[PDB]
Design a protein around this ligand. Sequence first.
Ligand SMILES: COC(=O)CNC(=O)c1cc(C)on1
Ligand SMILES: COC(=O)CNC(=O)c1cc(C)on1
Ligand SMILES: [Zn+2]
Ligand SMILES: [Zn+2]
Ligand SMILES: [Zn+2]
Ligand SMILES: [Zn+2]
Lengths: 197, 197
Amino acid sequence: SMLERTINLYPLTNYTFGTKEPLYEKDSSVAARFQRMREEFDKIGMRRTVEGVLIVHEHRLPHVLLLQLGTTFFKLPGGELNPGEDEVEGLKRLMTEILGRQDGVLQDWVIDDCIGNWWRPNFEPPQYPYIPAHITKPKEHKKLFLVQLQEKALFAVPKNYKLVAAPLFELYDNAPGYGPIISSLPQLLSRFNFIYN
Amino acid sequence: SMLERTINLYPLTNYTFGTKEPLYEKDSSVAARFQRMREEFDKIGMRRTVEGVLIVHEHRLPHVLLLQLGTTFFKLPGGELNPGEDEVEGLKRLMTEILGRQDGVLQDWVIDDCIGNWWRPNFEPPQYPYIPAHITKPKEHKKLFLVQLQEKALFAVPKNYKLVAAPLFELYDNAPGYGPIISSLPQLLSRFNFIYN
Ligand SMILES: COC(=O)CNC(=O)c1cc(C)on1
Ligand SMILES: COC(=O)CNC(=O)c1cc(C)on1
Ligand SMILES: [Zn+2]
Ligand SMILES: [Zn+2]
Ligand SMILES: [Zn+2]
Ligand SMILES: [Zn+2]
């Protein structure tokens, strides 16, 4: 009767948000972005992307940690895998690069749950939680994982971003604010048994 | 790197859809429905509901089995738990009542995965994949489970319903056609590794 995965959440006030050098995108525009996606596809095939969902609470309400690029777009911490790179080892690496500490102290990332899969059929924005009818060579595969945090940690946040804590209700049905992946996190996280430490 | 649950899907042509006596709803209208929900709440508290997701394929495309009530509403097989009734034992019972055989041959239901949770804060239609801000006494809790089918089976379908197989793309972003629970099944099923037998 208890088939649900059990997850420890801690207070947002348990975590320290420091700063480090800016981290700039590989692509200076959307047009550059899909161009580099075409070049790499012809050379090494489908892009493989990994993204981590980090969760906290304040006063027993779960929030998702989102990365805000100035006052423009919201992102989940993650990035592109190299060819032959392990998914889980890759997401740990990408999250050490983004939020890992100035003082070189190892973060202990715990990743044991897949929460979703998304596919990009063309060199265009549209993405789906399945492979569409007729598509044999999708251009990107995005994998999402749940990241269990330690009781406390310090995260060094590149100066050009801010780390914000979004409650679920703000995400729910906000595809325009957030896009179709982040706006379905409430549905995707509903199977978990959160403990509010 | 393989953290995904593995699920066996079979061809739709592997299953037989026979018929049995009509099964009528406890409530003859929406108004009757919320009235009986008020009466039962005051007596035994929050309504507890369970619903099963049954999946097949044809030519390697996953479909969800939906129950259609004439040409009106689409439903997942499930129903209301009695007080002190186990969730999993309840969903098996409710699914034997709905699709179990005229000839009294035991179906073998395999249920090992929670796929979601929904909450109804008032005696009204709106439901959310979380408990909203300020709500201490929600009126209904709905639990969704993945039901692994056997290679073949015969299902006896009450004469007043039809069992239809909906592909994911038809569900995706169709809240008006289907409502907010069924229309988010593609996001919810994306974590599984389907084998297409
Ligand atoms: C929309 O987000 C993605 O596609 C994956 N995330 C990143 O690339 C990323 C970049 C930085 C900094 O932190 N995460
Ligand atoms: C929208 O569906 C529900 O609330 C749960 N399902 C049923 O009550 C139900 C009734 C019959 C027949 O098969 N399933
Ligand atoms: Zn508090
Ligand atoms: Zn793929
Ligand atoms: Zn085929
Ligand atoms: Zn509850």
